[PDB]
PDB file of C-alpha atoms and ligand atoms in Angstrom:
ATOM      1  CA  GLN A  20     -36.384  30.270  17.734  1.00  0.00           C
ATOM      2  CA  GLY A  21     -39.011  28.719  15.425  1.00  0.00           C
ATOM      3  CA  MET A  22     -37.996  28.797  11.746  1.00  0.00           C
ATOM      4  CA  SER A  23     -35.314  26.122  11.481  1.00  0.00           C
ATOM      5  CA  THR A  24     -35.582  22.624  12.980  1.00  0.00           C
ATOM      6  CA  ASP A  25     -32.725  22.109  15.435  1.00  0.00           C
ATOM      7  CA  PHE A  26     -30.988  19.112  17.005  1.00  0.00           C
ATOM      8  CA  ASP A  27     -28.347  19.290  19.734  1.00  0.00           C
ATOM      9  CA  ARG A  28     -25.380  16.993  20.387  1.00  0.00           C
ATOM     10  CA  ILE A  29     -24.935  16.046  16.716  1.00  0.00           C
ATOM     11  CA  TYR A  30     -21.543  15.153  15.250  1.00  0.00           C
ATOM     12  CA  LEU A  31     -20.396  16.143  11.745  1.00  0.00           C
ATOM     13  CA  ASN A  32     -18.138  13.629   9.946  1.00  0.00           C
ATOM     14  CA  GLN A  33     -17.157  12.024  13.316  1.00  0.00           C
ATOM     15  CA  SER A  34     -16.087  15.413  14.749  1.00  0.00           C
ATOM     16  CA  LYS A  35     -14.541  15.376  18.213  1.00  0.00           C
ATOM     17  CA  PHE A  36     -16.762  18.337  19.150  1.00  0.00           C
ATOM     18  CA  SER A  37     -20.519  17.928  19.069  1.00  0.00           C
ATOM     19  CA  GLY A  38     -22.703  20.734  17.816  1.00  0.00           C
ATOM     20  CA  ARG A  39     -26.123  22.011  16.925  1.00  0.00           C
ATOM     21  CA  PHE A  40     -27.570  20.796  13.590  1.00  0.00           C
ATOM     22  CA  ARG A  41     -30.146  23.082  11.963  1.00  0.00           C
ATOM     23  CA  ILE A  42     -32.461  22.354   9.056  1.00  0.00           C
ATOM     24  CA  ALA A  43     -33.555  25.601   7.360  1.00  0.00           C
ATOM     25  CA  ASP A  44     -35.341  26.347   4.078  1.00  0.00           C
ATOM     26  CA  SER A  45     -31.975  27.648   2.816  1.00  0.00           C
ATOM     27  CA  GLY A  46     -30.114  24.396   3.536  1.00  0.00           C
ATOM     28  CA  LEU A  47     -28.292  22.747   6.459  1.00  0.00           C
ATOM     29  CA  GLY A  48     -26.096  24.089   9.146  1.00  0.00           C
ATOM     30  CA  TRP A  49     -23.906  22.724  11.929  1.00  0.00           C
ATOM     31  CA  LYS A  50     -21.951  24.611  14.596  1.00  0.00           C
ATOM     32  CA  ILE A  51     -19.671  23.447  17.389  1.00  0.00           C
ATOM     33  CA  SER A  52     -21.359  23.807  20.780  1.00  0.00           C
ATOM     34  CA  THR A  53     -19.145  23.610  23.831  1.00  0.00           C
ATOM     35  CA  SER A  54     -18.264  25.231  27.195  1.00  0.00           C
ATOM     36  CA  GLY A  55     -16.931  28.685  28.172  1.00  0.00           C
ATOM     37  CA  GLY A  56     -20.203  30.293  27.011  1.00  0.00           C
ATOM     38  CA  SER A  57     -19.523  33.571  25.193  1.00  0.00           C
ATOM     39  CA  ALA A  58     -15.781  33.053  24.878  1.00  0.00           C
ATOM     40  CA  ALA A  59     -15.537  29.668  23.118  1.00  0.00           C
ATOM     41  CA  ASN A  60     -19.102  29.395  21.693  1.00  0.00           C
ATOM     42  CA  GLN A  61     -18.981  33.000  20.294  1.00  0.00           C
ATOM     43  CA  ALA A  62     -15.856  32.608  18.168  1.00  0.00           C
ATOM     44  CA  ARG A  63     -17.281  29.464  16.545  1.00  0.00           C
ATOM     45  CA  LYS A  64     -18.360  29.654  12.849  1.00  0.00           C
ATOM     46  CA  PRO A  65     -21.001  27.381  11.261  1.00  0.00           C
ATOM     47  CA  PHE A  66     -20.697  24.799   8.558  1.00  0.00           C
ATOM     48  CA  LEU A  67     -23.310  25.812   5.968  1.00  0.00           C
ATOM     49  CA  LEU A  68     -24.572  23.612   3.156  1.00  0.00           C
ATOM     50  CA  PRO A  69     -26.908  25.358   0.683  1.00  0.00           C
ATOM     51  CA  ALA A  70     -30.026  23.444  -0.253  1.00  0.00           C
ATOM     52  CA  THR A  71     -28.893  23.570  -3.900  1.00  0.00           C
ATOM     53  CA  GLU A  72     -26.031  21.204  -3.018  1.00  0.00           C
ATOM     54  CA  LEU A  73     -28.320  18.441  -1.591  1.00  0.00           C
ATOM     55  CA  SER A  74     -28.913  15.447  -3.792  1.00  0.00           C
ATOM     56  CA  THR A  75     -29.910  12.330  -1.783  1.00  0.00           C
ATOM     57  CA  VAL A  76     -30.271  11.688   1.947  1.00  0.00           C
ATOM     58  CA  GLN A  77     -30.413   8.400   3.851  1.00  0.00           C
ATOM     59  CA  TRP A  78     -31.161   7.637   7.466  1.00  0.00           C
ATOM     60  CA  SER A  79     -28.698   4.942   8.534  1.00  0.00           C
ATOM     61  CA  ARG A  80     -26.537   3.600  11.394  1.00  0.00           C
ATOM     62  CA  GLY A  81     -23.999   6.007  12.824  1.00  0.00           C
ATOM     63  CA  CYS A  82     -21.093   5.581  15.234  1.00  0.00           C
ATOM     64  CA  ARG A  83     -23.357   7.251  17.694  1.00  0.00           C
ATOM     65  CA  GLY A  84     -27.014   6.279  17.251  1.00  0.00           C
ATOM     66  CA  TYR A  85     -28.620   6.912  13.897  1.00  0.00           C
ATOM     67  CA  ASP A  86     -27.157   9.072  11.143  1.00  0.00           C
ATOM     68  CA  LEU A  87     -27.905  10.986   8.013  1.00  0.00           C
ATOM     69  CA  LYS A  88     -25.560  10.279   5.123  1.00  0.00           C
ATOM     70  CA  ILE A  89     -26.077  13.120   2.727  1.00  0.00           C
ATOM     71  CA  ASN A  90     -24.751  13.038  -0.812  1.00  0.00           C
ATOM     72  CA  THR A  91     -23.884  16.469  -2.156  1.00  0.00           C
ATOM     73  CA  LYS A  92     -23.272  17.782  -5.654  1.00  0.00           C
ATOM     74  CA  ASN A  93     -19.771  19.001  -4.920  1.00  0.00           C
ATOM     75  CA  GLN A  94     -18.611  17.946  -1.469  1.00  0.00           C
ATOM     76  CA  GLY A  95     -18.965  14.161  -1.367  1.00  0.00           C
ATOM     77  CA  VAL A  96     -21.001  12.410   1.288  1.00  0.00           C
ATOM     78  CA  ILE A  97     -21.430  14.245   4.606  1.00  0.00           C
ATOM     79  CA  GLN A  98     -22.364  12.387   7.785  1.00  0.00           C
ATOM     80  CA  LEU A  99     -24.365  13.711  10.751  1.00  0.00           C
ATOM     81  CA  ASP A 100     -24.831  11.370  13.668  1.00  0.00           C
ATOM     82  CA  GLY A 101     -26.006  11.200  17.252  1.00  0.00           C
ATOM     83  CA  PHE A 102     -29.763  11.016  16.343  1.00  0.00           C
ATOM     84  CA  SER A 103     -32.341   9.028  18.280  1.00  0.00           C
ATOM     85  CA  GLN A 104     -34.890   6.767  16.624  1.00  0.00           C
ATOM     86  CA  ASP A 105     -37.406   9.402  17.705  1.00  0.00           C
ATOM     87  CA  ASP A 106     -35.813  12.009  15.418  1.00  0.00           C
ATOM     88  CA  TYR A 107     -36.667  10.240  12.175  1.00  0.00           C
ATOM     89  CA  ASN A 108     -40.235  11.357  11.680  1.00  0.00           C
ATOM     90  CA  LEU A 109     -39.399  15.038  12.069  1.00  0.00           C
ATOM     91  CA  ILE A 110     -36.383  14.732   9.785  1.00  0.00           C
ATOM     92  CA  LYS A 111     -38.410  12.927   7.119  1.00  0.00           C
ATOM     93  CA  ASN A 112     -41.087  15.626   7.186  1.00  0.00           C
ATOM     94  CA  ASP A 113     -38.615  18.510   7.095  1.00  0.00           C
ATOM     95  CA  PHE A 114     -36.622  17.146   4.167  1.00  0.00           C
ATOM     96  CA  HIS A 115     -39.842  16.504   2.220  1.00  0.00           C
ATOM     97  CA  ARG A 116     -41.407  19.889   2.883  1.00  0.00           C
ATOM     98  CA  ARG A 117     -38.309  22.097   2.705  1.00  0.00           C
ATOM     99  CA  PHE A 118     -36.388  20.385  -0.094  1.00  0.00           C
ATOM    100  CA  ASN A 119     -38.703  17.835  -1.733  1.00  0.00           C
ATOM    101  CA  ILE A 120     -36.167  15.161  -0.711  1.00  0.00           C
ATOM    102  CA  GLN A 121     -37.457  11.733   0.402  1.00  0.00           C
ATOM    103  CA  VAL A 122     -35.119  10.449   3.179  1.00  0.00           C
ATOM    104  CA  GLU A 123     -34.187   6.835   2.376  1.00  0.00           C
ATOM    105  CA  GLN A 124     -34.594   4.373   5.272  1.00  0.00           C
ATOM    106  CA  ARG A 125     -31.410   2.316   5.343  1.00  0.00           C
ATOM    107  CA  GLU A 126     -30.739   1.861   9.037  1.00  0.00           C
ATOM    108  CA  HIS A 127     -30.960  -1.927   9.290  1.00  0.00           C
ATOM    109  CA  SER A 128     -30.381  -4.912   7.087  1.00  0.00           C
ATOM    110  CA  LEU A 129     -34.043  -5.948   6.986  1.00  0.00           C
ATOM    111  CA  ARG A 130     -35.063  -2.757   5.113  1.00  0.00           C
ATOM    112  CA  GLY A 131     -36.841  -3.614   1.832  1.00  0.00           C
ATOM    113  CA  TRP A 132     -37.540  -7.261   2.722  1.00  0.00           C
TER     114      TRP A 132
ATOM    115  CA  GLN B  20      -5.045 -16.369  -2.645  1.00  0.00           C
ATOM    116  CA  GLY B  21      -3.816 -13.685  -5.080  1.00  0.00           C
ATOM    117  CA  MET B  22      -6.583 -12.344  -7.342  1.00  0.00           C
ATOM    118  CA  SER B  23      -8.665 -10.155  -5.041  1.00  0.00           C
ATOM    119  CA  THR B  24      -7.234  -7.599  -2.597  1.00  0.00           C
ATOM    120  CA  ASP B  25      -8.328  -8.512   0.928  1.00  0.00           C
ATOM    121  CA  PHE B  26      -8.622  -6.683   4.249  1.00  0.00           C
ATOM    122  CA  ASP B  27      -9.476  -8.309   7.578  1.00  0.00           C
ATOM    123  CA  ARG B  28     -11.373  -6.878  10.556  1.00  0.00           C
ATOM    124  CA  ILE B  29     -13.526  -4.548   8.433  1.00  0.00           C
ATOM    125  CA  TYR B  30     -17.049  -3.549   9.458  1.00  0.00           C
ATOM    126  CA  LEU B  31     -19.950  -3.119   7.013  1.00  0.00           C
ATOM    127  CA  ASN B  32     -22.483  -0.382   7.881  1.00  0.00           C
ATOM    128  CA  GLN B  33     -21.380  -0.465  11.579  1.00  0.00           C
ATOM    129  CA  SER B  34     -21.965  -4.246  11.788  1.00  0.00           C
ATOM    130  CA  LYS B  35     -21.486  -5.850  15.192  1.00  0.00           C
ATOM    131  CA  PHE B  36     -19.484  -8.633  13.512  1.00  0.00           C
ATOM    132  CA  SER B  37     -16.290  -7.768  11.685  1.00  0.00           C
ATOM    133  CA  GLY B  38     -15.430  -9.502   8.450  1.00  0.00           C
ATOM    134  CA  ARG B  39     -13.146  -9.859   5.487  1.00  0.00           C
ATOM    135  CA  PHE B  40     -13.489  -7.195   2.753  1.00  0.00           C
ATOM    136  CA  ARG B  41     -12.424  -8.256  -0.747  1.00  0.00           C
ATOM    137  CA  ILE B  42     -11.871  -6.102  -3.812  1.00  0.00           C
ATOM    138  CA  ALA B  43     -12.217  -8.182  -7.000  1.00  0.00           C
ATOM    139  CA  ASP B  44     -12.487  -7.263 -10.688  1.00  0.00           C
ATOM    140  CA  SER B  45     -16.151  -8.322 -10.440  1.00  0.00           C
ATOM    141  CA  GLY B  46     -16.958  -5.925  -7.585  1.00  0.00           C
ATOM    142  CA  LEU B  47     -16.792  -5.885  -3.770  1.00  0.00           C
ATOM    143  CA  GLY B  48     -17.435  -8.486  -1.187  1.00  0.00           C
ATOM    144  CA  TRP B  49     -17.689  -8.688   2.594  1.00  0.00           C
ATOM    145  CA  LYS B  50     -18.204 -11.740   4.809  1.00  0.00           C
ATOM    146  CA  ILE B  51     -18.554 -12.140   8.561  1.00  0.00           C
ATOM    147  CA  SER B  52     -15.419 -13.672  10.078  1.00  0.00           C
ATOM    148  CA  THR B  53     -15.699 -15.041  13.585  1.00  0.00           C
ATOM    149  CA  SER B  54     -14.911 -18.013  15.879  1.00  0.00           C
ATOM    150  CA  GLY B  55     -15.963 -21.695  15.855  1.00  0.00           C
ATOM    151  CA  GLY B  56     -13.986 -22.255  12.628  1.00  0.00           C
ATOM    152  CA  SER B  57     -15.904 -24.531  10.250  1.00  0.00           C
ATOM    153  CA  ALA B  58     -19.174 -24.393  12.160  1.00  0.00           C
ATOM    154  CA  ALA B  59     -19.872 -20.642  12.381  1.00  0.00           C
ATOM    155  CA  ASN B  60     -17.551 -19.362   9.592  1.00  0.00           C
ATOM    156  CA  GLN B  61     -18.818 -22.038   7.102  1.00  0.00           C
ATOM    157  CA  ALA B  62     -22.516 -21.183   7.286  1.00  0.00           C
ATOM    158  CA  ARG B  63     -21.757 -17.499   6.650  1.00  0.00           C
ATOM    159  CA  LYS B  64     -22.771 -15.993   3.248  1.00  0.00           C
ATOM    160  CA  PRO B  65     -21.071 -12.959   1.648  1.00  0.00           C
ATOM    161  CA  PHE B  66     -22.404  -9.543   0.860  1.00  0.00           C
ATOM    162  CA  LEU B  67     -21.648  -9.052  -2.848  1.00  0.00           C
ATOM    163  CA  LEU B  68     -21.757  -5.742  -4.684  1.00  0.00           C
ATOM    164  CA  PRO B  69     -21.265  -5.995  -8.468  1.00  0.00           C
ATOM    165  CA  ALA B  70     -18.868  -3.496  -9.977  1.00  0.00           C
ATOM    166  CA  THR B  71     -21.725  -2.226 -12.174  1.00  0.00           C
ATOM    167  CA  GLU B  72     -23.405  -0.817  -9.051  1.00  0.00           C
ATOM    168  CA  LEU B  73     -20.389   1.356  -8.010  1.00  0.00           C
ATOM    169  CA  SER B  74     -20.653   5.043  -8.713  1.00  0.00           C
ATOM    170  CA  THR B  75     -18.388   7.134  -6.421  1.00  0.00           C
ATOM    171  CA  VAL B  76     -16.079   6.199  -3.549  1.00  0.00           C
ATOM    172  CA  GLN B  77     -14.573   8.382  -0.825  1.00  0.00           C
ATOM    173  CA  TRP B  78     -11.980   7.651   1.813  1.00  0.00           C
ATOM    174  CA  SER B  79     -13.187   9.329   5.007  1.00  0.00           C
ATOM    175  CA  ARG B  80     -13.379   9.076   8.822  1.00  0.00           C
ATOM    176  CA  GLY B  81     -15.090   6.000  10.195  1.00  0.00           C
ATOM    177  CA  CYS B  82     -16.260   5.019  13.674  1.00  0.00           C
ATOM    178  CA  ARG B  83     -13.277   2.767  13.650  1.00  0.00           C
ATOM    179  CA  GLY B  84     -10.285   4.278  11.840  1.00  0.00           C
ATOM    180  CA  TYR B  85     -10.730   5.306   8.238  1.00  0.00           C
ATOM    181  CA  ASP B  86     -13.657   4.331   6.029  1.00  0.00           C
ATOM    182  CA  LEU B  87     -14.872   4.007   2.503  1.00  0.00           C
ATOM    183  CA  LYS B  88     -18.263   5.561   1.845  1.00  0.00           C
ATOM    184  CA  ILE B  89     -19.410   4.068  -1.400  1.00  0.00           C
ATOM    185  CA  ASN B  90     -22.348   5.455  -3.331  1.00  0.00           C
ATOM    186  CA  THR B  91     -24.199   2.821  -5.322  1.00  0.00           C
ATOM    187  CA  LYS B  92     -26.683   3.025  -8.173  1.00  0.00           C
ATOM    188  CA  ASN B  93     -29.423   1.189  -6.328  1.00  0.00           C
ATOM    189  CA  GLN B  94     -28.499   0.555  -2.707  1.00  0.00           C
ATOM    190  CA  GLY B  95     -27.680   3.964  -1.233  1.00  0.00           C
ATOM    191  CA  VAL B  96     -24.369   4.683   0.435  1.00  0.00           C
ATOM    192  CA  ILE B  97     -22.520   1.698   1.931  1.00  0.00           C
ATOM    193  CA  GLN B  98     -19.861   2.159   4.604  1.00  0.00           C
ATOM    194  CA  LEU B  99     -16.797  -0.025   5.239  1.00  0.00           C
ATOM    195  CA  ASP B 100     -14.611   0.922   8.159  1.00  0.00           C
ATOM    196  CA  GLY B 101     -11.746  -0.277  10.306  1.00  0.00           C
ATOM    197  CA  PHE B 102      -9.006   0.731   7.765  1.00  0.00           C
ATOM    198  CA  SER B 103      -5.576   2.029   8.716  1.00  0.00           C
ATOM    199  CA  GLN B 104      -3.990   5.071   7.106  1.00  0.00           C
ATOM    200  CA  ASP B 105      -1.623   2.556   5.518  1.00  0.00           C
ATOM    201  CA  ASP B 106      -4.474   0.968   3.540  1.00  0.00           C
ATOM    202  CA  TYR B 107      -5.204   4.020   1.411  1.00  0.00           C
ATOM    203  CA  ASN B 108      -2.571   3.660  -1.265  1.00  0.00           C
ATOM    204  CA  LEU B 109      -3.533   0.080  -2.079  1.00  0.00           C
ATOM    205  CA  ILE B 110      -7.230   0.939  -2.106  1.00  0.00           C
ATOM    206  CA  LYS B 111      -6.663   3.926  -4.392  1.00  0.00           C
ATOM    207  CA  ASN B 112      -4.691   1.798  -6.849  1.00  0.00           C
ATOM    208  CA  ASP B 113      -7.189  -1.064  -6.847  1.00  0.00           C
ATOM    209  CA  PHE B 114     -10.221   1.140  -7.440  1.00  0.00           C
ATOM    210  CA  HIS B 115      -8.416   2.928 -10.289  1.00  0.00           C
ATOM    211  CA  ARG B 116      -7.163  -0.204 -12.013  1.00  0.00           C
ATOM    212  CA  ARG B 117     -10.154  -2.498 -11.472  1.00  0.00           C
ATOM    213  CA  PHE B 118     -13.015  -0.026 -11.861  1.00  0.00           C
ATOM    214  CA  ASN B 119     -11.583   3.240 -13.216  1.00  0.00           C
ATOM    215  CA  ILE B 120     -12.877   4.908 -10.027  1.00  0.00           C
ATOM    216  CA  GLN B 121     -10.788   7.688  -8.429  1.00  0.00           C
ATOM    217  CA  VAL B 122     -11.181   7.397  -4.609  1.00  0.00           C
ATOM    218  CA  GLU B 123     -11.940  10.871  -3.221  1.00  0.00           C
ATOM    219  CA  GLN B 124      -9.798  11.929  -0.235  1.00  0.00           C
ATOM    220  CA  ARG B 125     -12.209  13.359   2.318  1.00  0.00           C
ATOM    221  CA  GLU B 126     -10.817  12.144   5.618  1.00  0.00           C
ATOM    222  CA  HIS B 127     -10.033  15.475   7.275  1.00  0.00           C
ATOM    223  CA  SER B 128     -11.292  19.011   7.172  1.00  0.00           C
ATOM    224  CA  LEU B 129      -8.112  20.437   5.640  1.00  0.00           C
ATOM    225  CA  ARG B 130      -8.606  18.471   2.381  1.00  0.00           C
ATOM    226  CA  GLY B 131      -8.683  20.832  -0.634  1.00  0.00           C
ATOM    227  CA  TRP B 132      -7.183  23.830   1.195  1.00  0.00           C
TER     228      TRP B 132
HETATM  229 CL1  LIG C   1     -36.074  28.239   7.826  1.00  0.00          CL
HETATM  230 CL1  LIG C   2     -10.165 -10.442  -9.052  1.00  0.00          CL
END
């Protein structure tokens, strides 16, 4: 749809359901994405995190693939995982441009050597 | 050994190896614990995080069991996982007494309701 940057099959805080993660100028969103089409998917409500609540963001190792661990002003650290190594460049650019946040690279133990 | 509070089979940042996690007055430690006895275990060096680097700590959902996500002054967010629900009370008490840190309970979505 062309405004937000979207990623499918992402998990929020080790959720059993996967969902779609969206990066918008307004902040972040995540919504359960499943089967049943317009029954089950239509009742679902999004998790919405306003950009004002973002403080730091790191790209690190998830349970599934790579993750973002996102520290917030009022809601602790939120985890999104299920990313591919391929996703990093896009994520880095989006967080810089939309939020002026530099994503920290902390996904292996040789970082900073 | 009676000074530190120790937990076995804990993983650091989704490490392939598990190790022993130790909570001491001086800060946190983690060291790979494996087989071979005094060959492989003896060469291993610990990860050491001085108490001065601790800022916030939350108890949340790991890849394995429950986790701590620990925000540090200079090293981003560190994850320890592999904890049982049983571990929480001890952890809460140790972080309060040793560091004056209140562990945030953020391990399910009904927290704060
Ligand atoms: Cl947008
Ligand atoms: Cl001690």
